[PDB]
């Protein structure tokens, strides 16, 4: 984490690299660079909530696109069933969507997840986009809160 000071003294690409893990949309980060100086924490994620609530299907497909699917990193009980059930739902979805399971996992645990998953599976198009969408802005605002500091 870095103070706020030195996020608004940073070069434009330096700024920009540092709010580059955050979500992979380059559009995001630019903007918030170019609002630079930020007189206080609060204000910067208000105007990070307002860069990323208009973010649509578009937006969505470009952050995902080099996202890692299920099956591409090769390695009864409660827990075994849950594991199972996790993965084979997660296959399911991007078979269904065409696109990486997306969900802000910290906080929520496995059953919670697959509840979520389960339920997702069953969305519309429509449905799916929108809170697929939701999930990353949560991310995104949990990594900006991860990173700059007051």
């Known amino acids: 984490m870095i103070a ?3 996020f608004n003294s940073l070069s434009k690409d330096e700024a920009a690299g540092l ?3 955050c979500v992979a949309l380059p ?3 630019e903007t918030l660079v170019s609002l630079r100086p930020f007189a206080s924490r609060h204000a910067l994620l208000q105007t990070a909530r307002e860069a990323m609530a208009n973010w649509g299907e578009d937006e969505l497909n470009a952050a995902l696109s080099a996202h890692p699917r299920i099956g ?3 390695t009864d009980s409660e827990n075994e069933r849950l594991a199972q059930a996790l993965r084979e739902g997660n296959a399911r979805y991007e078979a269904r ?3 990486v399971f997306l969900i ?3 906080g929520r645990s496995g ?3 697959l509840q979520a998953l389960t339920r997702r599976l069953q969305h519309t198009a429509d449905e799916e986009v929108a809170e697929a969408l939701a999930q990353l802005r949560e991310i995104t605002m949990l990594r900006l809160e991860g ?3 007051e």
């Open 4 to 6: 706020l000071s030195q």
């Open 19 to 21: 709010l580059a893990p």
């Open 27 to 29: 559009a995001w980060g």
């Open 72 to 74: 591409e990193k090769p």
């Open 97 to 99: 969507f065409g696109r």
């Open 104 to 106: 802000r996992a910290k």
């Open 111 to 113: 059953e919670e997840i």
């Open 147 to 149: 990173a700059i500091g």
